[PDB]
């Protein structure tokens, strides 16, 4: 056969008769307008096809032509800075072509521009007749000033070079490489086609050792994440699950950034592409905007529900491809709970039996096959480069309830879990990461990095997590039996933990001094507030009974100027770098002398 | 007793959904067969047979149905049950989910072919577990010590360090010299696979471990035939090669979750919370393959780790496990928040074979009474601690001095300390020293006399 015929439509799914030689997960095009669909089930002569666009007006007598290929992206230059939908069609070309403000629901816009020309240069001793394998760099293309899009071979094939293009400007459809095999001399180009449901082959995985500097104070200190790690950000509506995701895409220590909007708002992707081209960052003393390193996969809630499956798998396929260049890729999935609602709506039409709360039984296998594609890993190919993929997947639980089959299947896979709280957003405590229920399992793996650069921070967080731990048990005390009967070793605990909750954990992301703090500033103000609790420990412990001693109202009325240096320590904007370490020891020296005074 | 007729090859699939492939026109199909799906791309996938009906047979492929056509695939019927190639050489190597090697090695040379379902033991000729295994953990050997041959899970929750106390009872696995660990990893990450693969080569113990692994990358149908194929090599080394094994299945909850996907795709009538009705029996045939026979010298003990969803012991995975096994080890969340390693809660954890693995002949005279008394002051101490937050007796602060000293000094022992049982009872008696002689009700005076003043 070469095409099919629709037999019945019901929402997103499409049953198509006269379709025998079609495999599972093919890419067919149903309708007179050729809506792009994928086969998800077939029973004998018919196939059941989910459709990545809105089925409306699709009749029974419509043709369904099949292509014999899975859902695949086009990987090559022209992919950074642009904005795509779930099936990788560029949203900037699709409005400069049709001149409208809508997506015309039938257009086959090429995923990469076959008209713009990039300056190619070969990989500098790639000789003719040299042996070449699958996945090594045979040329460099400078897409922007920041990113050198290293052209690679597909991982399937390999051979001996017969022709390489001379250094110059080429299209994305020009033949650049021809390789001889046993049978056939095979042509190539600058683009490659890879199926999004198949994991990219790679040499051997490596342990993760370098941390992901997100810039937040509570995130980098208590629950750190490494590049090559998996992270989940749950929390109810209005908690700020995306302002941590937009703080990751602006100020991370990552080479490229790929932001995936899966069932997101339409204004939240327009918020991204507006304020990014004025945020210039430096790498080698040169400033350029972060839109050179950010690629948006935009699939809003208005856009159809079967395409939410594709926008997650596309954005991790671009993230796996840029990993093969050696770049330390990051990925912000936003949000995977709207992806799991696409699995429920599709399986509802197929009469599948549900698991707990509506979702299908394979929900734990789709999330595991997506989160486990992250991790720093020595790539394929001869130039011997080590890349990474770090997945930060936002989760939107309904009603703020973490006993949910999306979240409970997520936490068995992710290592870091930044549990946001809804009570911490009524009081304007931003970021709202609940420091009790949140955890990270990167800590034992990260102190080896800490015993090289910042050699005092592991005993710091052990006491910083402890003072927040003892505050929670004593908060239930003072709300029942009152604060009047409290001890003096515990009333100092209730103040410095309240001093942590407005200095350290609170962080106004829109001011010039707390929109991104480095790690020396974060370890700086924590090395003082813990030393303040350690010094005020001795003021009660050693002179406990004998002398008419410090009852700490002595301290709170006399040391108010040093506490004002602590309560305003966070105000060091990035115009001072070496001064902040001096002021950290200067405000310590004000704290050093007053135990004698 | 070998078969020699040439195998048929059916090119007549007629339906595929999820992990299932439905065949037609099959001539005399057999239940629980093994097949070989040859894809049009030349890929080879295997599969059991879930249900025959006349000329139909619905197979479940292991490596997923992605790519299977309706006319070009060919499914070749092997005329027997899935029989794994087992050998003594399956020791010191690393295998994937179903049966293939990982460390660039050979396929095994098949000393004998054994059924992965096993065959049921005679309950009359099964000797009782009496010899006590010293795990080194004070929270186990002090309170709920495990005997050789005893099946006993570690009830964890998601996020808790259950893998670091899984490898802790590998290095400190010994009696109070051929302790061949058989490991089975189901639904683990790569960063948890590196924590188990590179912690058996660190102690040099990789000359006796048979680490299986089934990562989250690998498909979910292979999780079903992992503990049936990891036990039947452990059943070979312990009943046919007279070697003491210890099998540590991992993440039983994930093994169940793979059972739910096949059950929901089969459209069977389900049980509690989506799991199939037969999960009690399905978790019984991979749990009851433990203990030791009376005719041989070997033994097989089972420590199957499982995480409970949302810290719930009433979930069907820890519920049916506590009805098949012989008591649990409940590593808790709140003790982990107080930075205890291992964070084992000693109140719901239990061992039904601690009563017959302790005493004057086995370990020492005071094991039976210090384990009841440390349990007594911990259980009475908890409800008075709840009234403490919301006084009234000077002996109530004695019980809260027990709670402050129990969690910090007894159960907390660090990641590399191996307390022997002779060292364990001395630290347990020091906790009862803060209580008077009269307040220890469940210790008789004949055992309280010579042990309390020291």
């Amino acid at each position: 056969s070469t095409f099919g015929y629709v037999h019945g439509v019901s929402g997103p799914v499409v049953t198509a008769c006269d379709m025998a030689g079609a495999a599972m997960y093919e890419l067919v095009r149903v309708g007179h307008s050729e809506l792009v669909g994928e086969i998800i089930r077939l029973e004998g002569d018919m196939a059941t096809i989910q459709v990545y666009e809105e089925t409306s007006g699709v009749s029974v007598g419509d043709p369904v032509l099949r292509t014999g290929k899975p859902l695949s992206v086009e990987l090559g230059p022209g992919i950074m800075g642009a904005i795509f939908d779930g099936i990788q069609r560029p949203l900037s070309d699709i409005s400069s072509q049709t001149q409208s403000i809508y997506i015309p629901r039938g257009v086959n816009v090429s995923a990469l521009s076959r008209d713009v020309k990039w300056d190619f240069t070969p990989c500098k001793n790639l000789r003719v007749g040299s042996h070449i394998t699958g996945g090594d760099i045979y040329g460099i293309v400078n897409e922007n000033s920041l990113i050198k899009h290293k052209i690679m071979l597909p991982p399937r094939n390999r051979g001996t070079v017969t022709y390489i293009a001379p250094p110059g400007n080429y299209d994305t459809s020009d033949v650049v490489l021809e390789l001889e095999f046993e049978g056939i001399k095979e042509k190539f180009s600058m683009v490659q086609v890879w199926p999004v449901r198949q994991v990219r082959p790679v040499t051997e995985k490596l342990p993760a050792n370098h941390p992901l500097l997100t810039g937040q104070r509570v995130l980098d200190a208590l629950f750190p994440c490494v590049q090559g790690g998996t992270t989940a950000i749950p929390g109810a509506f209005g908690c700020g699950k995306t302002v941590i995701s937009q703080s990751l895409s602006k100020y991370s220590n990552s080479d490229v950034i790929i932001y995936v909007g899966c069932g997101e708002r339409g204004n939240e992707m327009s918020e991204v592409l507006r304020d990014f081209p004025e945020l210039t960052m430096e790498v080698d003393g040169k400033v350029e905007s972060i839109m050179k390193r950010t690629a948006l996969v935009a699939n809003t809630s208005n856009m159809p529900v079967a395409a939410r499956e594709a926008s997650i798998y596309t954005g991790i396929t671009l993230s796996e491809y840029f990993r093969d260049m050696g770049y330390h890729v990051s990925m912000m999935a936003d949000s995977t709970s709207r992806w799991a609602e696409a699995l429920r709506e599709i399986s509802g039409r197929l009469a599948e039996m549900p698991a707990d709360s509506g979702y299908p039984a394979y929900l734990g296998a789709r999330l595991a096959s997506f989160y486990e594609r992250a991790g720093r890993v020595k790539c394929l190919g001869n130039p011997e480069r080590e890349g990474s993929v770090s997945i930060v997947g936002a989760v939107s639980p309904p009603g703020g309830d973490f006993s949910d089959p999306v979240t409970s299947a997520t936490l068995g896979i992710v290592q870091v879990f930044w549990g946001l709280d809804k009570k911490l957003a009524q009081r304007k405590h931003f970021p709202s990461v609940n420091w009790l229920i949140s955890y990270s399992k990167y800590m034992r793996a990260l102190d080896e990095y800490y015993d090289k650069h910042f050699t005092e921070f592991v005993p710091l967080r052990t006491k910083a997590k402890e003072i927040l731990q003892e505050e929670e048990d004593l908060a239930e005390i003072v709300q029942l039996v009152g604060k009047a009967s409290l001890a003096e070793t515990d009333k100092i605990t209730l103040e410095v933990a309240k001093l942590i909750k407005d200095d350290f954990l609170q962080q106004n992301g829109y001011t010039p001094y707390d929109r991104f703090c480095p790690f020396y500033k974060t370890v700086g103000m924590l090395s003082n507030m813990i030393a303040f609790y350690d010094m005020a420990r001795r003021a009660v412990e050693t002179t406990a009974q004998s002398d008419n001693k410090i009852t700490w109202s002595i301290i709170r009325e006399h040391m108010g100027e040093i506490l004002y240096k602590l309560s305003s320590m966070k105000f060091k904007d990035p115009v001072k770098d070496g001064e902040a370490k001096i002021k950290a020891d200067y405000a310590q020296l004000l704290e050093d002398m007053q135990n004698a005074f | 007793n070998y078969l020699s007729q040439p195998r048929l090859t059916y090119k007549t699939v007629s339906g595929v959904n999820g992990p299932l492939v439905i065949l037609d026109h099959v001539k005399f199909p057999r239940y629980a067969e093994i097949v070989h799906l040859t894809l049009p791309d030349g890929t080879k996938r295997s599969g059991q047979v879930l249900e025959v009906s006349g000329s139909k047979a619905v197979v479940q492929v292991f490596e997923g149905t992605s790519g299977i056509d309706a006319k070009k695939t060919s499914c070749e019927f092997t005329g027997d049950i899935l029989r794994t190639p087992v050998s003594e050489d399956m020791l010191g190597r690393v295998f994937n989910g179903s049966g293939k090697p990982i460390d660039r090695g050979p396929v095994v040379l098949a000393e004998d072919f054994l059924d992965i379902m096993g065959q049921p033991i005679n309950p009359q000729c099964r000797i009782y577990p009496e010899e006590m295994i010293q795990t080194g953990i004070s929270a186990i050997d002090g309170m709920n010590s495990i005997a050789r041959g005893q099946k006993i899970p570690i009830f964890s929750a998601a996020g808790l360090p259950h893998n670091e106390i899984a490898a802790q009872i590998c290095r400190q696995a010994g009696l109070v010299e051929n302790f061949a660990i058989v490991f089975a990893a189901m639904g683990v990450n790569m960063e948890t696979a590196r924590f188990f693969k590179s912690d058996f080569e660190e102690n040099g113990s990789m000359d006796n471990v048979c680490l299986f692994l089934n990562l989250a990358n690998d498909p979910t149908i292979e999780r079903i035939i992992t503990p049936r194929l990891a036990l039947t090599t452990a059943e070979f080394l312990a009943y046919q090669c007279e070697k003491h094994v210890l099998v540590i299945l991992t993440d039983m909850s994930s093994y169940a979750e793979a059972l739910r996907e096949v059950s929901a795709a089969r459209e069977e009538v389900p049980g509690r919370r989506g799991f199939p009705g037969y999960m009690y029996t399905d978790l019984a045939t991979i749990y009851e393959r433990a203990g030791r026979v009376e005719g041989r010298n070997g033994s097989i003990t089972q420590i199957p780790i499982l995480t409970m969803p949302n810290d719930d012991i009433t979930h069907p995975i820890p519920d049916l496990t506590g009805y098949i096994t012989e008591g649990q080890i409940y590593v808790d969340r709140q003790l982990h928040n107080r930075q205890i390693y291992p964070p084992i809660n000693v109140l719901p954890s239990l061992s039904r074979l601690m009563k017959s693995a302790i005493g004057e002949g086995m370990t020492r005279k005071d094991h039976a009474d210090v384990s009841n008394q440390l349990y007594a002051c911990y259980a009475i101490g908890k409800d008075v601690q709840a009234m403490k937050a919301v006084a009234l007796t000077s002996d109530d602060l004695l019980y809260l001095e027990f709670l402050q000293k129990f969690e910090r000094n007894f159960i907390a022992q660090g990641p590399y300390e191996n307390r022997t049982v002779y060292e364990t009872l001395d630290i347990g008696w020091q906790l009862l020293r803060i209580f008077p002689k009269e307040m220890l009700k469940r210790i008789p005076q004949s055992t309280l006399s010579e042990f309390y003043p020291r």
Binding site: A351, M353, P354 | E267, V269, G274
Partner: peptide
């Protein structure tokens, strides 16, 4: 009530396929 009613409809569709 959704899982049991799904089987009640699938016991009828399987019945009329036999009839």
């Amino acid at each position: 009530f959704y899982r049991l009613k799904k089987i009640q409809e699938k016991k009828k569709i399987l019945k009329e396929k036999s009839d």
